[PDB]
Design an enzyme around this catalytic site. Sequence first.
Site, PDB file in Angstrom:
ATOM      1  N   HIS B  41      22.827  37.314  23.549  1.00 45.66           N
ATOM      2  CA  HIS B  41      22.236  38.601  23.198  1.00 45.66           C
ATOM      3  C   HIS B  41      22.359  39.636  24.317  1.00 45.66           C
ATOM      4  CE1 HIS B  41      18.506  38.198  25.556  1.00 45.66           C
ATOM      5  NE2 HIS B  41      18.184  37.069  24.946  1.00 45.66           N
ATOM      6  N   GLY B 143      13.291  40.604  30.959  1.00 45.86           N
ATOM      7  CA  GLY B 143      14.420  40.305  31.804  1.00 45.86           C
ATOM      8  C   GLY B 143      14.484  38.897  32.339  1.00 45.86           C
ATOM      9  N   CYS B 145      15.261  36.404  30.549  1.00 42.11           N
ATOM     10  CA  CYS B 145      16.280  35.711  29.774  1.00 42.11           C
ATOM     11  C   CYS B 145      17.367  35.142  30.673  1.00 42.11           C
ATOM     12  CB  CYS B 145      16.895  36.690  28.776  1.00 42.11           C
ATOM     13  SG  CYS B 145      15.671  37.576  27.822  1.00 42.11           S
TER      14      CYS B 145
HETATM   15  C1  LIG Z   1      18.035  41.321  21.455  1.00 39.06           C
HETATM   16  C2  LIG Z   1      16.865  40.364  21.202  1.00 39.06           C
HETATM   17  C3  LIG Z   1      17.438  38.995  20.818  1.00 39.06           C
HETATM   18  C4  LIG Z   1      16.065  40.887  20.009  1.00 39.06           C
HETATM   19  C5  LIG Z   1      15.978  40.293  22.460  1.00 39.06           C
HETATM   20  C6  LIG Z   1      15.363  41.436  22.950  1.00 39.06           C
HETATM   21  C7  LIG Z   1      14.555  41.425  24.074  1.00 39.06           C
HETATM   22  C8  LIG Z   1      14.321  40.234  24.777  1.00 39.06           C
HETATM   23  N1  LIG Z   1      13.526  40.228  25.969  1.00 39.06           N
HETATM   24  C9  LIG Z   1      13.936  40.656  27.196  1.00 39.06           C
HETATM   25  O1  LIG Z   1      13.139  40.823  28.114  1.00 39.06           O
HETATM   26  C10 LIG Z   1      15.346  40.934  27.440  1.00 39.06           C
HETATM   27  C11 LIG Z   1      16.497  40.940  26.701  1.00 39.06           C
HETATM   28  N2  LIG Z   1      17.510  41.268  27.559  1.00 39.06           N
HETATM   29  C12 LIG Z   1      16.962  41.467  28.769  1.00 39.06           C
HETATM   30  N3  LIG Z   1      15.660  41.281  28.749  1.00 39.06           N
HETATM   31  C13 LIG Z   1      12.093  40.098  25.819  1.00 39.06           C
HETATM   32  C14 LIG Z   1      11.726  39.729  24.314  1.00 39.06           C
HETATM   33  O2  LIG Z   1      11.995  38.604  23.853  1.00 39.06           O
HETATM   34  N4  LIG Z   1      11.101  40.626  23.546  1.00 39.06           N
HETATM   35  C15 LIG Z   1      10.858  40.389  22.122  1.00 39.06           C
HETATM   36  C16 LIG Z   1       9.771  41.312  21.602  1.00 39.06           C
HETATM   37  C17 LIG Z   1       9.534  41.083  20.110  1.00 39.06           C
HETATM   38  C18 LIG Z   1      10.816  41.268  19.319  1.00 39.06           C
HETATM   39  C19 LIG Z   1      11.895  40.337  19.833  1.00 39.06           C
HETATM   40  C20 LIG Z   1      12.142  40.552  21.325  1.00 39.06           C
HETATM   41  C21 LIG Z   1      11.312  39.072  26.628  1.00 39.06           C
HETATM   42  C22 LIG Z   1      10.057  39.372  27.143  1.00 39.06           C
HETATM   43  C23 LIG Z   1       9.345  38.417  27.841  1.00 39.06           C
HETATM   44  C24 LIG Z   1       9.905  37.171  27.991  1.00 39.06           C
HETATM   45  N5  LIG Z   1      11.095  36.835  27.473  1.00 39.06           N
HETATM   46  C25 LIG Z   1      11.776  37.784  26.800  1.00 39.06           C
HETATM   47  C26 LIG Z   1      14.941  39.073  24.290  1.00 39.06           C
HETATM   48  C27 LIG Z   1      15.739  39.112  23.156  1.00 39.06           C
END
Ligand SMILES: CC(C)(C)c1ccc(N(C(=O)c2c[nH]cn2)[C@@H](C(=O)NC2CCCCC2)c2cccnc2)cc1
Lengths: 305, 306
Positions: B41, B143, B145
């Site tokens: 992603h 971030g 991830c």
């Molecule tokens: C594109 C996709 C698959 C929807 C996505 C988006 C954002 C992230 N998250 C990144 O922080 C992130 C992504 N790229 C850099 N940082 C964060 C995340 O899951 N929020 C979610 C909020 C609800 C909807 C789905 C995403 C995250 C936060 C804290 C701990 N873990 C992860 C993960 C996945």
Amino acid sequence: SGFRKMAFPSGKVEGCMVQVTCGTTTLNGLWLDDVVYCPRHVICTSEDMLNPNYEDLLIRKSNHNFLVQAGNVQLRVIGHSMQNCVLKLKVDTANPKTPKYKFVRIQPGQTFSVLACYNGSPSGVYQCAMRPNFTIKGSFLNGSCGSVGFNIDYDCVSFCYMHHMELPTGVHAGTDLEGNFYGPFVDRQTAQAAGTDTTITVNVLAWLYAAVINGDRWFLNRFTTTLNDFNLVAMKYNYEPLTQDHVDILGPLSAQTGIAVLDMCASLKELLQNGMNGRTILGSALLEDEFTPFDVVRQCSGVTF
Amino acid sequence: SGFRKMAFPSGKVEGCMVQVTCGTTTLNGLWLDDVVYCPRHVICTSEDMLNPNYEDLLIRKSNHNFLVQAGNVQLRVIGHSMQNCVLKLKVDTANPKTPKYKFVRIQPGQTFSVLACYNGSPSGVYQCAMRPNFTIKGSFLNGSCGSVGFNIDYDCVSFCYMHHMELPTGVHAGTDLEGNFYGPFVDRQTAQAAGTDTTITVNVLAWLYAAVINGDRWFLNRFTTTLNDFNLVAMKYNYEPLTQDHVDILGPLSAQTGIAVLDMCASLKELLQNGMNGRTILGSALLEDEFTPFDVVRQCSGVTFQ
Ligand SMILES: CC(C)(C)c1ccc(N(C(=O)c2c[nH]cn2)[C@@H](C(=O)NC2CCCCC2)c2cccnc2)cc1
Ligand SMILES: CC(C)(C)c1ccc(N(C(=O)c2c[nH]cn2)[C@@H](C(=O)NC2CCCCC2)c2cccnc2)cc1
Ligand SMILES: [Cl-]
Ligand SMILES: [Cl-]
Ligand code: NA
Ligand code: NA
């Protein structure tokens, strides 16, 4: 989201751990530049340990009495001396993995990471606090002596603890890296015991702030208190007194959450007087006191090294 | 003596962490030999996180669209491929700090260490378990991830988890290092939510054995139980079924302590019924379920404090 007991990354310390052997005794040493640090009780025999004359045991020793092993490589000992309760072995090779470091002596209530080692090999890492009674509630088996505790700041390792012995209740005693004990303990086999402990109030408050940041709010209430009134409750429940300096240190968390320290103190007062009524806070049924205010801010803000 | 949540020393994994940037997005990657592994992603656009087509997004990328930074060094990407939900970037330099390693997919109830990282830099290390509902209760910020989970039994790093996303209750979902998710989760923005979780029974029993090894017997009783009666009771408290496999796994701890496995089951049934009456077990006032039998044997003495 989430909140865990978190240790510092241990790699910079792993590269410093060596095995030290004197006679039949093996334990761990810390190899920094061309010196290996370890507990001076490595030179004790079973017999000396009741009433060791460390001055005399050491003069009796020579460089060749000490075997130092870094992984599979023997390090040649070229000098030896004592500083307080720490033995210093000068070796002929400087550790190429020596990190930027300082020796620091911590205060009760401060936390640090422990790298538990056996036979010079890192085995595990965990977080713990210097208790008000100067013990640590570690996890250590026979041969763990010489394991160290540390904090990291950017690229700089602050070594604060070297493990020496286990007390009868199963908690642990040790020194700073200059060989000064934490607490009223001595490195010999004698009647010694942990004193009555208390709970680290400022850390409980920090953890309550962590809980609020993470969405746990059931314990908040409309009331505030004063330092004097709260400290009478603290004394009643064997909590450390809360000082004005503690209030100032928690000032950040107080602004972010909307709960002034004395507002949060009123929550803790009520938790002490009435319990949790079957509820939990951050997945605990007890009030947790081994997170400092800085630990909370760092974990909740993602500080890296 | 003592008993702590104990992680593996993290140095061998620290030396593998890098930062991967694609467009405006930065997250972590794992650099092993000449390959950087990260969540696919990283190529998802901010404008469409709901229904990305990763094959179509990736075919549009050149190698130079991926920026990989190892500390202060930019690594040159020379190829890329997608495996399930993991992106594999081939780089021009092999990681000289690559440890002995393997990739392992774990079962619910298994534990591992997590090295939480931001911008390719380590923040801290903690212990986790794969929950029965295929989430982990991590501590992860935006971030995080590409941070990984691992064990290091006998000097070999077994990578078992790569972090991908946060679910609505604040728990975490990710993949093995072949890019297959644990559980039914997907790497896009949906209404997905963790199922009702349950307690890892075999681990609670392991931890009660740890308590006995460290000298505490107050919770034992004079009773035993059949395996089926234990499960009938335990499931009423949202405990996972205990299988004969679990009973076999606990054999060594039973042997060390002299407490038959079904006698320890009887103790657990009574603890669920009664609570702790103001007492603690190994410093906790709740029953702990993120220590496995293997974990207890690793940490505890080989000699019971009788
Ligand atoms: C594109 C996709 C698959 C929807 C996505 C988006 C954002 C992230 N998250 C990144 O922080 C992130 C992504 N790229 C850099 N940082 C964060 C995340 O899951 N929020 C979610 C909020 C609800 C909807 C789905 C995403 C995250 C936060 C804290 C701990 N873990 C992860 C993960 C996945
Ligand atoms: C010489 C001296 C100071 C009396 C001593 C003796 C043994 C050790 N212990 C070593 O395991 C050990 C020593 N050298 C290699 N291993 C262990 C220890 O404290 N038992 C104590 C038992 C009561 C009397 C004092 C010693 C130990 C176990 C678990 C965790 N921490 C340490 C420590 C200190
Ligand atoms: Cl002396
Ligand atoms: Cl498994
Ligand atoms: Na030095
Ligand atoms: Na209040």
